[model samples]
Target: RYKAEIGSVSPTTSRDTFEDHDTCFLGVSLENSNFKPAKVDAMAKWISRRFSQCTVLIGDSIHRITLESTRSMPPRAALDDALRLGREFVESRQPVFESFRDRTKFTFVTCSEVQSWGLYGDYHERLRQHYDQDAAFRGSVEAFGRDYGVSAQELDHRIRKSSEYFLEEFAIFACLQRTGSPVMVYPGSFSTLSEIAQGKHPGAPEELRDLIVVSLHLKG
Candidate 1:
């Protein structure tokens, strides 16, 4: 079984980034500093390889921060700001994900629990329609580029990376949330974003980790 060859972490925060570091929370925001759009497909594959099924969440602006965007959204807007814009970024990368051989093994969706939140300024229905079409998507890309100073292509890459990061954080958050464990781990790969798991609590159970591996055996 793959679990036989899985990676293990010391009970202490040894590495900068744990394999399960990202999916550790429900609220997430994707921006250039944290959003590496390019990482989504590869990361998804990584998750799929290690497990059978994983939940994929999408949002308009889950991680829209100043570094990625030409302008910054207010902190109050939070990750919700990325919801409308996020859908566009996800739409652009459909081909990359769809082409993967193991794609169908996992599920893709955006649920309210972990879905992007915030007010839709306008074009709410249009955004939904655009998700299923091309021209509307194009316009959205252009609009995002114009508003953010990054080209559509650049924005695409950024969104892809951000989504990837978001998933990473989401997984860590979900597992910890589900197991009701303390955030006993942190990733050395980056700075500390959440203090919940920083100090020390027992941590998620060993069985829960195994349960996660077992859960991956999801039916496509």
Candidate 2:
């Protein structure tokens, strides 16, 4: 089975619009080594072809973001795969930057590997791995406060419920915030959090109101 699944596009839009809008978050994630670059490239090509007509309609009103992320299950291989994809995206998408930036949805992307990249040891493991223990710990704590609306103590209490693997959720969030990447820790495994942010679904967290990754081309 897949480590995680992505949601289908919301039905509010016509099938045609959703088709063009759905992959906005794939960003640079297609290169995950679990498969091969060719596969992701094919998928991207397919999507591009499928939506070529629709992109004309989206015009300049809204921007689409391909938010790529990886499943951070304890094993680490999953993350490796996702990271592979991120690199692929970076390498593959460069040539079209000018066209994408000016004509399309001003495409932008960010990725999180969800494994060793977080720089924090798993829950209760003690800060033994990452070089900067204090920095990583502090980052995770701040993410909890900012995203989950919880004190450090309260956040720990929730994370304690996870036994199969140390809850490195906070650590991941921290990394995501630092890299300006979006995350996938909601509704599926981290429902405790998705609720607070109202995110894993229709609502994006209000707490992220101040984040400004890229300025929109308002004229579009």
Candidate 3:
């Protein structure tokens, strides 16, 4: 069963290319199992080796770990015991910055859910700010509207109509900002935004070109 599940969740090699690099996305399961922690660690290491940089979102707290920091990963034993315990565990080993090769960078985000990070009324505020402050983003929005054959007024109305769900979608932009690579991997527990990342969602405000979203699931 473990081998079969591993095969099912294995990341695929074929992917869309962006910025002269291949973009791949896969979802991982966060549920506890004998193989969970080891599998996750292996996957993370593999991703760091495969891409120059990538962002990983783990379901828990809202902490960001980068290769430039002095933070060391929790001990392997703690990770094997329990995922939450692993977060509590600390190591005094060399900083992650020196542990890995200089060529690859990895950003790990510990958050319960992406939407939760956008809450507290900040989502709409950011939306308003982006439209008012960023001319480039505004132009893209306008271009998208024109391509869809909608008048500016109608486009504004549609944006307002779908404003309630924007909070959840805002997390994607946040993740994108943390990593240079277009690839992002998160737990399967997240509200999947693969369609939005792929520019397939009709309600998406702008086309997210070169975005690759992957979610991981686990089998007991």
TM-score of each: 0.38, 0.28, 0.41
lDDT of 1 by residue, 1-220 (tens): 1111213333335333334433321122333322344444444454544333344444333344433344555655645555555566456656645655453343444533333323221223333343335443333333433323657887776554443443334344344445432222221222122211332211322222322211111111
In TM-score terms, candidate 1 sits at 0.38
Which runs in model 3 stand beyond 4 Å of their true positions? 1-14, 22-35, 62-86, 89-103, 112-181, 187-192, 207-210, 215-220
Worst 10 residues of 1 by lDDT: 211-220
User: Could you tell me which 10 consecutive residues in candidate 3 have the lowest summed lDDT?
Assistant: 61-70
Q: What is residue 59's positional error in candidate 3, in angstroms?
A: 3.3
lDDT of 2 by residue, 10-57 (tens): 221322333322222232214224223343333334334323221111
Q: Residue 120 of model 1: what lDDT?
A: 24
Error of 2 at 164 (Å): 16
Error (Å) of candidate 1 at residue 151 is 34
What candidate 2 gets wrong by more than 4 Å, as runs, is 1-8, 12-16, 19-25, 52-89, 92-108, 111-220
Q: Among these predicted structures, which one has the highest lDDT?
A: 3
45-102 per-residue lDDT for model 3 (tens digits): 4455556655444432222121111144454432333346324421211133234446
lDDT scores in order: 0.37, 0.31, 0.39
